[PDB]
């Protein structure tokens, strides 16, 4: 069982951190897409300029 | 995004240096103590017929 108990629990952290990296990249295309908002909103404004 | 594969391509790929040279370490000598006692038990082993 401890032996059982160990190696499954070796995939799961080695899962968690496949998971992991993936976020990352969610993450951070996200905390770029935010950047691309405040891009539209001044755009646009640039745009409304009379 | 190339870093992030190249991080992921490292995460992958690379051991943990240090764990597995202390681990490989620990099974090693471990491994050579049992050899010199191989050894001497051979002398052990012969001496007593005489």
Redesign the interface.
Known sequence: RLEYEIKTLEQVKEST?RAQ?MT??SM?ALQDMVKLLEDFKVKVTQAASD | LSV?VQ??KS?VIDVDYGEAMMNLMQVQLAYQASLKASTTISQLSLLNYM
């Open positions: 951190s990296e990352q990249n951070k | 992030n991080s992921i995460n």
